[PDB]
Amino acid sequence: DIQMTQSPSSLSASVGDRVTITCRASQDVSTAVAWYQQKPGKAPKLLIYSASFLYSGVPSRFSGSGSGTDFTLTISSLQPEDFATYYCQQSYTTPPTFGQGTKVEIKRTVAAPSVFIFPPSDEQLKSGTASVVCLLNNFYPREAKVQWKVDNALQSGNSQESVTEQDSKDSTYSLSSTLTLSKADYEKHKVYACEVTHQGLSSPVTKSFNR
Amino acid sequence: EVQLVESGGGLVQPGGSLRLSCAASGFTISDYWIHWVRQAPGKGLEWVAGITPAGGYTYYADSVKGRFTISADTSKNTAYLQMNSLRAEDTAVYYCARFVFFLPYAMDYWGQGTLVTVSSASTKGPSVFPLAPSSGTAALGCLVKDYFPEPVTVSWNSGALTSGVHTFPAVLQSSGLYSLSSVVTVPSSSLGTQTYICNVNHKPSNTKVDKKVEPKSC
Known about the structure:
The structure holds two protein chains of two kinds. By secondary structure, chain A is mainly beta.
């Protein structure tokens, strides 16, 4: 089974940048290599076939090169709508195999997150469980550190984070941290604090409330 | 008008069975290979099975061999993946794609995908709880908790509000149920002067909740 390894696995680049992705096959595959583009919640789109040929309707700024084991995709001038995951694929033998994918991220200037803390609803409490939500809105880069202080105590393995896909307009991320406890355990504590560490912040920001 | 349209994904128990279909329009399936390629949540693209032009031959990945059958019904111009003895690790989005060794010998037309989720958990619709704004410009939202399986749709003020909305990727809780939250930032002058309803949909459980998000008591 022919293995396809892409390089790098992920990258950050700005609009107008020349970007190149490489693909290396575990054995010679002639020029029988294709490149695909994939956007969240959508099927892959053929970009290049036969290593170097532009698929009908794909814009001239996509190009491909290579043969044998080493292959290359180039985007001469990166457009907004070019952030996706790119995949090479070997077509020389059955079964066809894909590379692991290269996530092309959009590089921009550091932006600080607006922090918001949301208490459990009086409606949720009536079910015996309590969810406390901490929001990090519109920030960059992705890397962040959210800390849950509960009556001045750190927490471990009882909160969960989710991160938004890169934004359409301003290319920022957004993050939710959700702290989950029981009602009887939520009731017996007072200060609920969400501590946020981020590069765009001058000093770690705590957003809290009083029970 | 060439296209590949799939259906048949859903929830099955481990050891259960499912059949995915792949309807071709504007070309004859039997003129092409059909491949099924799958994408486990967050992972890459794994080829699963292939059937040859005219139904001459059939190939399977080792992870799937002896459990899955690929074929087609030509009178229906539709290809199939019959999935038996399903396991947790078969949970993925499943794509069909056409292919031939004639140019461009690449996968030019694809189906949209269907979610196959393999679990011993029952279908469960979410509870929807408001995230009431604390205390410039402020934030509010909806917590969509404890549902199975994926996916969930969220929209605000019946679609008349989009700017500044972030619906988060669901997170699998250690209870086995999914949870997510959808959030929006608003002008603090237009809150308490404009009503905010989030519109949660959970098709798998036929659950549709609309929620009025308003400020708290104290």
